[PDB]
Amino acid sequence: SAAPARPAHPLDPLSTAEIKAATNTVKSYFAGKKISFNTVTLREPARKAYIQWKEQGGPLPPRLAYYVILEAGKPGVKEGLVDLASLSVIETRALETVQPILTVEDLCSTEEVIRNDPAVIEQCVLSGIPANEMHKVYCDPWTIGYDERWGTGKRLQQALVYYRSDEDDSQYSHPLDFCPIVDTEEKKVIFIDIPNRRRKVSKHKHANFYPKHMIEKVGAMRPEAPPINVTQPEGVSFKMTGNVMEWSNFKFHIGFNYREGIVLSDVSYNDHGNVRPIFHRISLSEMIVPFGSPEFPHQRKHALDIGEYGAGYMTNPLSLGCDCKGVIHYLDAHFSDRAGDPITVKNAVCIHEEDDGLLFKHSDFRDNFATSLVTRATKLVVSQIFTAANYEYCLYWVFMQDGAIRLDIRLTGILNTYILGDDEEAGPWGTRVYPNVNAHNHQHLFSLRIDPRIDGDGNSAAACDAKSSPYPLGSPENMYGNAFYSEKTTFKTVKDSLTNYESATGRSWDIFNPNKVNPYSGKPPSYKLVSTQCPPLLAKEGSLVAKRAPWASHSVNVVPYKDNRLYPSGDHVPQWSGDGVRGMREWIGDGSENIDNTDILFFHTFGITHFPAPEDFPLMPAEPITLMLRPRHFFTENPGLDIQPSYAMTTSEAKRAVHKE
């Protein structure tokens, strides 16, 4: 058989060979049809099949490839599965009223089409840009998001237009006032949204940020600062076997796909010989960046980056020394292009360990701290950085030596901007960050998808709220009124889980195994979600934003596990009106399904609300976002105590050294 070679691990992404094998198979199946490839990626094995293979000597799951194609002259898409071993299409269906994720190829041609469009050219002339300077006009190709004038009838993009006085300028200080709508398949402008109040191109200098620009703007650059060198002469402590990582007792598979980007699977912790499962899969499953200006056509700015462009497709090849400093281990990403040929993104993921301050410390005041023990912490970082036109999303999955797992995100890049008239007030929907530049308010929301396996199978979730004792001050039960406890509300049905972060109770959430008990505390083993950057969805109920991102309405959504329940806003996000039972809305159903002690899926909504300020322009300083999953009642004691201390002196040793007591 010409079947491609099987991977080392069932969860390994498709190899370039498998991708090509998949596309050859699809092409043969659709022989005579003019088709193009939109997506060719690994169809992960069923959860049960994988676990049986992994721990019960079960059979090796079939190596499958999921594909999405377009056929010239045919509406929507066609999707299906290819069994790589037998090189055959085993599943396929047409979806004529849906539009797929926009690939780099899908987006690359838009700029040239608007530049050569007569209606667009006329608009540029009207805006103060001569027809013979169209090479100075640029545009960020966006999914149209959703426009009720066309639905999914045509595959559309909207173009946010900008102007560069010089090719090296940062165009964002000079947005134009109109918005062209482009037919992706036909590669032509079908309409242009033009404001009632016209604003011609800004005549100010561009707000630039490269050194040559800064030298002109301010005196010059600051002197090169003294270097801070990081070296690991004896190598690193982590061990990579293919995509399998081993570090500080943690063991997991590092996967990656066009959409979610990094995908961490089969996460376990070796508790002194007892290898205990934690999570079967964890990743970012969707996002939405809803803008806050009510004015047309700005309601169309609420990109669901992961589902509409792909955190994988948009990922940057990481530059050693700059993006990832120190001794780095890189991983590449493989996708398919429109023709069905494998494409590779080098250094899409970087892995390394860093010093992370103190892990723990304690000194005895009795001998003036002579008795002391200090142990420094080391963290393991698995990261990627993707670019969504103007913004940059830096993602860092962090593993720590106390057994905690953290997701750190840094937002940078450039503010989305729209033109502002000389006599126009930007507030309250935006900020004038530069003359004639309006940076609209917006939120950055993410959907963390957790498939738990806390110390094994059979899990539950709960909200934990800190509360004062119900007994009043002066009562026998709370004489001095200081009593307080943690109220744990275990979610029984899906409906019970739809909860938001609450500052009034310093709310946290537990993902636990009700089938086990901690021998000391008597509480079930668990990982606690500690997350406070949980903005409420500001768009109203029934709004386009709320309908297309049903998951964003609550900080936490817990539903029964089902295979292929990955994307909360549906499988094909672009141009979906938000009407219909799909994604999270489908999984929630009538909210009556059991989620207590069974296989569950935990979707957490977190992020920030951004009100632009001049400090964010013309290039924005990194803004941090973070959440953490901590083991609570999982271990019987601090799991990092067997790590060699950086310094340690006992009381007896102190007496000896001290002098002679």
Q: Does 310 bind its own copies (CB under 8 A)?
A: no
Q: Which stretch binds Cu ion (CB under 5 A): 354-362, 432-440, 579-587, 606-614?
A: 606-614
Whether residue 307 is annotated as binding a ligand: the answer is yes
Nearer residue to Cu ion within complex by CB, 438 or 513? 438
CA distance 97 to 37: 18
Burial category of 559 from C-beta neighbours within 10 Å (exposed 0-12, middle 13-18, buried 19 and up): buried
- By Cβ distance, which residue is nearest to Cu ion? 610
Contact between residue 451 and residue 422 where contact means Cβ atoms under 8 Å apart: no
Whether residue 145 is annotated as binding a ligand: the answer is no
Q: Does 661 bind its own copies (CB under 8 A)?
A: no
Q: Does 423 bind its own copies (CB under 8 A)?
A: no
Out of 178, 250, 509, 634, the only residue in the binding site for its own copies (CB under 8 A) is 634
Residues 6+ apart with CB under 8 A from 501: 507, 531, 532, 534, 555
- Interactions with its own copies, residue window 324-343 (CB under 8 A): 325-326
Q: Which of 37, 38, 40, 59 is nearest to 48 (CA)?
A: 59
Out of 60, 90, 473, 581, the only residue in the binding site for its own copies (CB under 8 A) is 473
How many residues touch its own copies under the rule CB under 8 A: the total is 174
Shortest Å distance, C-beta 76 to its own copies: 25
Nearer residue to Cu ion within complex by CB, 280 or 610? 610
Shortest Å distance, C-beta 77 to its own copies: 24
CA distance 69 to 41: 12
Among its own copies, Cu ion, none, partner that 543 touches (CB below 5 to 8 angstroms by kind):
its own copies
Shortest Å distance, C-beta 166 to its own copies: 8
Q: Does 422 bind its own copies (CB under 8 A)?
A: no
Q: Which of 284, 265, 276 is nearest to 9 (CA)?
A: 265
Q: Does 307 bind its own copies (CB under 8 A)?
A: no
Which three-class secondary structure string do you get for 332-355?
EEEEECCCCCEEEEEEEEEEEEEE
Out of 83, 177, 305, 392, the only residue in the binding site for its own copies (CB under 8 A) is 392
Q: Which stretch binds its own copies (CB under 8 A): 20-28, 180-188, 367-375, 598-606?
A: 367-375
Out of 422, 423, 590, 642, the only residue in the binding site for its own copies (CB under 8 A) is 642
Tell me the sheet residues that pair with 559.
601
Whether residue 314 is annotated as binding a ligand: the answer is yes
Whether residue 214 is annotated as binding a ligand: the answer is no
Among Cu ion, its own copies, none, partner that 613 touches (CB below 5 to 8 angstroms by kind):
its own copies
- Interactions with its own copies, residue window 276-305 (CB under 8 A): 290-294, 296, 298-299, 302
Q: Does 134 bind its own copies (CB under 8 A)?
A: no
Q: Does 440 bind Cu ion (CB under 5 A)?
A: no
Query: Among residues 391, 396, 561, 567, which one is catalytic?
Result: 391
Nearer residue to Cu ion within complex by CB, 572 or 610? 610
Q: Does 363 bind its own copies (CB under 8 A)?
A: yes
**Pattern 563-602, binding to Cu ion, x per CB under 5 A?**
----------------------------------------
Which pair of tokens denotes residue 356? 């992370």
Out of 60, 131, 230, 581, the only residue in the binding site for its own copies (CB under 8 A) is 230
Burial category of 423 from C-beta neighbours within 10 Å (exposed 0-12, middle 13-18, buried 19 and up): exposed
CA distance 157 to 145: 8
Contact between residue 335 and residue 258 where contact means Cβ atoms under 8 Å apart: yes
- Interactions with its own copies, residue window 526-555 (CB under 8 A): 532-536, 538-546
What Rg do the C-alpha atoms of the chain give, in angstroms?
27
- Interactions with its own copies, residue window 57-96 (CB under 8 A): none
Q: Does 646 bind its own copies (CB under 8 A)?
A: yes
CA distance 463 to 28: 52
Among Cu ion, its own copies, none, partner that 493 touches (CB below 5 to 8 angstroms by kind):
none
Kindly report the backbone phi and psi dihedral angles of residue 168, in degrees, each rounded to the nearest multiple of 5, phi listed first.
-85, -5
Token match 């992370």: residue? 356
510 is catalytic: no
**426: number of CA atoms within 13 Å, CB side?**
21
Q: Which of 651, 629, 650 is nearest to 405 (CA)?
A: 629
Which three-class secondary structure string do you get for 442-499?
EEEEEEEEEEECCCCCCEEEEEEEEEECCCCCCECCECCCCCEEEEEEECCEHHHHCE
Among Cu ion, its own copies, none, partner that 47 touches (CB below 5 to 8 angstroms by kind):
none
Which pair of tokens denotes residue 80? 């299906």
CA distance 524 to 510: 10
Tell me the sheet residues that pair with 508.
464
Query: Among residues 117, 305, 455, 571, which one is catalytic?
Result: 305
Whether residue 308 is annotated as binding a ligand: the answer is yes
Burial category of 364 from C-beta neighbours within 10 Å (exposed 0-12, middle 13-18, buried 19 and up): middle
Whether residue 390 is annotated as binding a ligand: the answer is yes
Q: Which stretch binds Cu ion (CB under 5 A): 210-218, 290-298, 483-491, 610-618?
A: 610-618
- Whether the upstream peptide bond of residue 574 has omega within 30° of 0, thus cis, is no
**42-65 burial, b if ≥16 CB within 10 A, otherwise e?**
bbbbebebbbeebeeeeeebbbbb
Out of 174, 280, 547, 610, the only residue in the binding site for Cu ion (CB under 5 A) is 610
The residue type at 64 = L
Q: Does 302 bind Cu ion (CB under 5 A)?
A: no
Q: Does 493 bind its own copies (CB under 8 A)?
A: no
- Interactions with its own copies, residue window 577-616 (CB under 8 A): 608-609, 611, 613-616
User: How many CB atoms are closer than 10 A to CB 496?
Assistant: 17
CA distance 181 to 146: 12
Shortest Å distance, C-beta 447 to its own copies: 18
The residue type at 515 = N
Q: Does 1 bind its own copies (CB under 8 A)?
A: no
402 is catalytic: no
Token match 């790590």: residue? 643
User: How many CB atoms are closer than 10 A to CB 210?
Assistant: 11
State the binding site for Mn(2+): 451, 599-600
State the binding site for substrate: 303-314, 388-393
**Contacts with Cu ion, residue ranges (CB under 5 A):** 610
State the binding site: 303-314, 388-393, 442, 444, 451, 599-600, 610
Residues annotated as catalytic are 305, 391
